[PDB]
Amino acid sequence: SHYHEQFLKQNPLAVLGVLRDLHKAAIPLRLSWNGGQLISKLLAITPDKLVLDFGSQAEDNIAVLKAQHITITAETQGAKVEFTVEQLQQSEYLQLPAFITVPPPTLWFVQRRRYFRISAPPPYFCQTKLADNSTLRFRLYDLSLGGMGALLAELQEGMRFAQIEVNMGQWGVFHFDAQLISISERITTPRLSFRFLNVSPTVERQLQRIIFSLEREAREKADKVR
Ligand SMILES: Nc1nc2c(ncn2[C@@H]2O[C@@H]3COP(=O)(O)O[C@H]4[C@@H](O)[C@H](n5cnc6c(=O)[nH]c(N)nc65)O[C@@H]4COP(=O)(O)O[C@H]3[C@H]2O)c(=O)[nH]1
Numbered sequence: 344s345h346y347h348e349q350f351l352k353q354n355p356l357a358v359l360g361v362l363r364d365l366h367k368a369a370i371p372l373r374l375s376w377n378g379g380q381l382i383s384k385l386l387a388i389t390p391d392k393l394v395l396d397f398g399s400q401a402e403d404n405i406a407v408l409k410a411q412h413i414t415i416t417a418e419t420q421g422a423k424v425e426f427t428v429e430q431l432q433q434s435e436y437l438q439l440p441a442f443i444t445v446p447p448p449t450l451w452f453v454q455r456r457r458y459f460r461i462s463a464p465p466p467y468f469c470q471t472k473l474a475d476n477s478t479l480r481f482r483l484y485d486l487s488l489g490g491m492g493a494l495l496a497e498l499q500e501g502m503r504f505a506q507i508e509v510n511m512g513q514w515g516v517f518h519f520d521a522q523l524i525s526i527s528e529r530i531t532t533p534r535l536s537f538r539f540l541n542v543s544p545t546v547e548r549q550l551q552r553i554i555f556s557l558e559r560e561a562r563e564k565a566d567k568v569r
């Protein structure tokens with residue numbers, strides 16, 4: 344795929360830095376190709392070698408090995424990483440199976456989020472009616488100045504809503520004009536992504552304050568871990 348060209352790393356040391364960081368942090372890697380996917384890990388990296396853990400499933404390992412053009416994505420703090428390799432070949436690392444490949448000559452280091460996102464806790468409830476007058480309810484997952492993630496029905500990306508209630512318990516209750524911008528999966532549990540519409544400056548300051556206090560509270564409690 345493609346992202347803003349500012350996100351594309353091409354300097355070999357640039358590409359390598361990002362990869363060494365995935366390794367040192369043990370970030371899970373998601374391999375996908377035409378017809379399958381599997382979770383792996385960066386086991387070791389040199390300028391000439393990428394070594395990836397085998398998958399858990401013998402069938403996925405057989406199917407990666409005959410694939411071409413394999414996309415690898417990883418989710419780190421503050422970024423999404425993504426690159427492609429032409430093929431994986433079997434090897435051994437520390438006496439156990441592994442995939443080896445030449446590193447990609449380029450990689451995406453994707454950082455599109457303008458606003459900080461804080462995770463919701465003890466769960467917070469939300470609810471809205473649908474065009475057929477039933478009531479959709481879901482659990483808030485995370486929160487930013489411009490939107491919210493929710494965990495759970497037949498809906499469609501692009502759906503716009505108007506009066507969506509957010510009971511954040513001890514803090515208080517609010518609503519927003521939000522648009523369902525992404526339906527995905529999270530563990531087989533479905534996940535919604537909302538961007539807020541028509542957020543007045545008054546509400547912006549409210550959202551700022553709540554996000555602040557939740558962050559500060561996590562800080563205070565974790566200090567208390569002492
Ligand atoms: N349209 C839209 N959809 C959103 C937005 N936020 C979350 N989603 C949807 O929710 C899925 C999961 O987001 P996540 O848990 O933060 O999990 C994300 C997050 O860890 C990371 N990621 C992707 N892009 C970025 C980024 O630009 N910045 C950061 N820091 N992480 C990113 O990769 C994971 C998977 O990303 P996806 O495959 O795209 O899958 C995303 C996407 O379908 C958004 O602002 N707009």
Ligand SMILES: Nc1nc2c(ncn2[C@@H]2O[C@@H]3COP(=O)(O)O[C@H]4[C@@H](O)[C@H](n5cnc6c(=O)[nH]c(N)nc65)O[C@@H]4COP(=O)(O)O[C@H]3[C@H]2O)c(=O)[nH]1
Binds near residue numbers: 485493524
């Ligand atoms: N807490 C929370 N807030 C959400 C969620 N989804 C959307 N928002 C809010 O909605 C704003 C605009 O979303 P957008 O139009 O998809 O525009 C997004 C989208 O195009 C893209 N993007 C950011 N993160 C992701 C991601 O994880 N996956 C994908 N596919 N796209 C992303 O970058 C643009 C800017 O991202 P932001 O500055 O963060 O701005 C986001 C964020 O403030 C969510 O799941 N959780």
